[PDB]
C-alpha cells in the first residue's frame, strides 16, 4: 500500500440527518445501530486479517528439487547452532539469540559487540568491538547453496456505491423536507429571502453574456454602452500601469 | 490499568504494536530465497512506537503493563532478528525483559 490514502471521485459513506422527527420515523437510531454493528464486525474482521499472519568423466545432474528451503551451512556456523541444515532465517535468529544469551552488547554501546572465541572463529576476525551490521552481513556469505548429485569415476464497492447514492437521495429528501418545514414555521422572512437570493443568483448567472465569440468581434460593446459600467472605465488605470 | 481493561482494546496491541515497529522498512524477504529454483534505517512511526513501548515497559510490581509485555517479547524478538536498527532501539525493554 501507499503512505497517503487514494483520492477517488465517487462519494463514500455520506452523513445521516439527525434533525428528522423521530416520533414518525423511529428508524434513524436503528440505522445507527446497524452502522455501529457493521463497524464492530469490520473491526473484528480487520483484527483477524491482521492477526492471521502475525578418460574418466564425471557425472553431474542439475536436479529438479533444488529449492531454498534447506540451504547448506558452513561447518563453522553449523557447530555454533547445532542443526545441520534447518532454514535460512533460523540461523540468523539462533545467532542473535546466542549473542543475547551471552550478553555481549553492554553490562555505539549496542552496535559494537564483544567478540568471543566462537564469534572470532566463525568470522575470521581479530577485533574486539565490531558492529552487528557487519555481523549479520557476513551471514549471507557464510551460507552455501545445496550441491547437486556428483558421481566421479468486487461487488462490495458497487454495493457501497449504491448505499452512498441512496443516502444522498435521503439527504435530498431531508433537505427538501427541512425547507418546507421552515417555510411552515415562518412564512415571512423566507419568501423575502427567496426574492433576494434567487434575484442575486439570476444576476450571477446573467454576469457572463458579453464575452462570446460573435459578440466580442462586433462593436456593440464599446460603442454607446455607458450603461454597462463594467468595462470602458479602467482605460485610465491600465494605461498608467503599462498593461496596454 | 484503564488502557488494558476491556476485552477488545487490550488485544489490538497484541498484534498491531509489533506490526508498527517494522512498518515502511525494507525488511529482508525470504520468498526470493525460497524461489531460486538490509534497510539500515527506520521510519517515522517506528521511533514513536519504540518510545511508547519503552515507557510502557516501566510498569513495575507486575501490574497491567508487565503482564502485557511478557506475551509480546517472543514476537518482537522475531523482528529484532532482521532489523539491526531495532538492536540500537528498544534499549530499556530488553533490560526489563
Amino acid at each position: 500500500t501507499q503512505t497517503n490514502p487514494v483520492p477517488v471521485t465517487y462519494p463514500t459513506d455520506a452523513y445521516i440527518p439527525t434533525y428528522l422527527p423521530d416520533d414518525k420515523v423511529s428508524n434513524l437510531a436503528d440505522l445507527k445501530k446497524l452502522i455501529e454493528m457493521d463497524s464492530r464486525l469490520d473491526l473484528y474482521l480487520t483484527r483477524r486479517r491482521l492477526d492471521t499472519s502475525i578418460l574418466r568423466c564425471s557425472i553431474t545432474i542439475q536436479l529438479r528439487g533444488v529449492d531454498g528451503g534447506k540451504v547448506q551451512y558452513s561447518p563453522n556456523l553449523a557447530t555454533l547452532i547445532g542443526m545441520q541444515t534447518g532454514s535460512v532465517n533460523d540461523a540468523v535468529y539462533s545467532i542473535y539469540k546466542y549473542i543475547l544469551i551471552n550478553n555481549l552488547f553492554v553490562t555505539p554501546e549496542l552496535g559494537e559487540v564483544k567478540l568471543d572465541s566462537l564469534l572470532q572463529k566463525v568470522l575470521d576476525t581479530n577485533a574486539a568491538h565490531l558492529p552487528l551490521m557487519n555481523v549479520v552481513q557476513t551471514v549471507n556469505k557464510l551460507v552455501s547453496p545445496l550441491p547437486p548429485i556428483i558421481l566421479d569415476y468486487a461487488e462490495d464497492t458497487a454495493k457501497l456505491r449504491e448505499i452512498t447514492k441512496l443516502a444522498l437521495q435521503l439527504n435530498s429528501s431531508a433537505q427538501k423536507y427541512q425547507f418546507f418545514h421552515e417555510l411552515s414555521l415562518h412564512p415571512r422572512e423566507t419568501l423575502t429571502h427567496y426574492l433576494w437570493s434567487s434575484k442575486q443568483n439570476e444576476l450571477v448567472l446573467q454576469g457572463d453574456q458579453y464575452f462570446n465569440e460573435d459578440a466580442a468581434r462586433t462593436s456593440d460593446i464599446y460603442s454607446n454602452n455607458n450603461n454597462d459600467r463594467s468595462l470602458m472605465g479602467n482605460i485610465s488605470l491600465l494605461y498608467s500601469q503599462g498593461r496596454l | 490499568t484503564e488502557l488494558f481493561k476491556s476485552k477488545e482494546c487490550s488485544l489490538i496491541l497484541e498484534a498491531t504494536l509489533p506490526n508498527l515497529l517494522s512498518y515502511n522498512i525494507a525488511t529482508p524477504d525470504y520468498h526470493l530465497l525460497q524461489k531460486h529454483k538490509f534497510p539500515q534505517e527506520l521510519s517515522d512511526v517506528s521511533k514513536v512506537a519504540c518510545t511508547f513501548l519503552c515507557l510502557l515497559s516501566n510498569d513495575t510490581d507486575d501490574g497491567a503493563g508487565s503482564a502485557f509485555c511478557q506475551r509480546i517479547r517472543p514476537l518482537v524478538l522475531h523482528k529484532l532478528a532482521d532489523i539491526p536498527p531495532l538492536t540500537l532501539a528498544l534499549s530499556e525493554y530488553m533490560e526489563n525483559t
Partner: peptide
C-alpha cells in the same frame, strides 16, 4: 496454546545451545 508452544520451543532451543556449548568441553580435551 500459542503461549504454551513458545515457552517450550524457547527452552528446547536453549537446551540445544547449551549442548552446543558442551560440545566444546569435549573438543578441548582432545
Amino acid at each position: 496454546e500459542k503461549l504454551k508452544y513458545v515457552k517450550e520451543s524457547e527452552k528446547m532451543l536453549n537446551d540445544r545451545l547449551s549442548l552446543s556449548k558442551q560440545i566444546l568441553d569435549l573438543n578441548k580435551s582432545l
